[PDB]
Amino acid sequence: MPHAFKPGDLVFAKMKGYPHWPARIDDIADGAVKPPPNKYPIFFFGTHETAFLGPKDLFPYDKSKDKYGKPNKRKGFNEGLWEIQNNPHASYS
């Protein structure tokens, strides 16, 4: 049975106006800005951007990849598909 989200988990993350996007739950570094309550820091592969999202917008990658893991015309998306498949836990800073 599933647990709550934790840093390192792999997802597709949904933002209004954007396709379900390859992403991870990030950690928060000592001294760094924390998310709002009930929100997680989401690192988007390919764009390397961060947004704060709740579980309603987070789809676990294993379950969802057959639906959402297909190329897309949007900037960064296909690089993001490579990252989540090939090195999802690397530093992209």
UniProtKB/Swiss-Prot annotation:
Tissue expression summary: Widely expressed. High expression is found in heart, skeletal muscle, ovary and testis. Overexpression is frequently observed in hepatocellular carcinoma samples.
Result after altering residue 21 to A: Loss of interaction with histone H3K36me2
Compartments reported by the entry: Nucleus; Cytoplasm
PWWP domain: residues covered: 7-64
Organism domain of life: Eukaryota
Function: Acts as an epigenetic regulator of myogenesis in cooperation with DPF3a (isoform 2 of DPF3/BAF45C). Associates with the BAF complex via its interaction with DPF3a and HDGFL2-DPF3a activate myogenic genes by increasing chromatin accessibility through recruitment of SMARCA4/BRG1/BAF190A (ATPase subunit of the BAF complex) to myogenic gene promoters. Promotes the repair of DNA double-strand breaks (DSBs) through the homologous recombination pathway by facilitating the recruitment of the DNA endonuclease RBBP8 to the DSBs.
Family designation: Belongs to the HDGF family.
Oligomeric form and interacting partners: Interacts with HDGF. Interacts with trimethylated 'Lys-36' of histone H3 (H3K36me3). Interacts with trimethylated 'Lys-79' of histone H3 (H3K79me3), but has higher affinity for H3K36me3. Interacts with IWS1. Interacts with H2AX, POGZ, RBBP8 and CBX1. Interacts with histones H3K9me3, H3K27me3 and H3K36me2. Interacts with DPF3a (isoform 2 of DPF3/BAF45C). Interacts with SMARCA4/BRG1/BAF190A, SMARCC1/BAF155 and SMARCD1/BAF60A in a DPF3a-dependent manner.
Protein name, UniProt field: Hepatoma-derived growth factor-related protein 2
Species per Swiss-Prot/TrEMBL record: Homo sapiens
Gene that encodes it: HDGFL2
